[PDB]
Amino acid sequence: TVAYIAIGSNLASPLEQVNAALKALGDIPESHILTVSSFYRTPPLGPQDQPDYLNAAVALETSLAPEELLNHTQRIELQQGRVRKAERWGPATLDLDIMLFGNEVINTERLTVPHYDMKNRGFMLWPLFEIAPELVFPDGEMLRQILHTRAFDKLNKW
Ligand SMILES: [Cl-]
Known part of the structure; x- marks a missing residue:
């Protein structure tokens, strides 16, 4: 089954943290990385000297x-x-975060799939659209349409 995973980090030097997280993902048993998006950048809220995600x-x-x-x-x-x-x-x-699991809809205490707020997060949807532009959510919503109708923050590549 194809699962879509979101990776986010503002840790240390984040490029190498996400690459390490990718390697661990591919090391998961019975599981294989098919595609990875470009890396994007999300600044922190506030003017404060904080690392970008x-x-x-x-x-x-x-x-x-x-x-x-x-x-x-x-x-x-x-x-x-x-x-x-x-x-x-x-x-x-x-x-x-497990964004999507096949066409499954899971609502349980430890796991909600689709991820509960992904349709509102540009930093999840834009990378996802890069690797799955024809995606349709289990409820029938088209990813392309959500990107034409919701307001997201500007999101630059890393
Ligand atoms: Cl859905």
């Missing part, structure tokens, strides 16, 4: 169940994020 989307072929894939994205966040030596929330983070 690097955003990407990945198409991952997987024979795992969605909750299994979740286990693996949660593990990588821990193993590759600054949770142990810092905090869960901590301004600085590595985020791995």
Whole structure:
């Protein structure tokens, strides 16, 4: 099944953090990276001297169940994020989100698919449109139309 994963990081030097996260993604069992988007840049809110976020989307072929894939994205966040030596929330983070899983709709306590806010986030939708321009969401919404009708922040490549 094709899953779409969002990767986000404002950690350290973020290019190498996202490349590491990509490698770990491809190391997930029964799962294969099909395509990766360009890398995009999201500035922080505020005027404050804070690191920019690097955003990407990945198409991952997987024979795992969605909750299994979740286990693996949660593990990588821990193993590759600054949770142990810092905090869960901590301004600085590595985020791995399952945006889409096949045409599945999953509404459970530990997993909601499609990701609950992705239609509102340019930094998820634009990279996704780069690698899947003909995508249609499980509810029948066309990705191309959402991009013509919702207001997103300007989003430059990294
Ligand atoms: Cl949907």
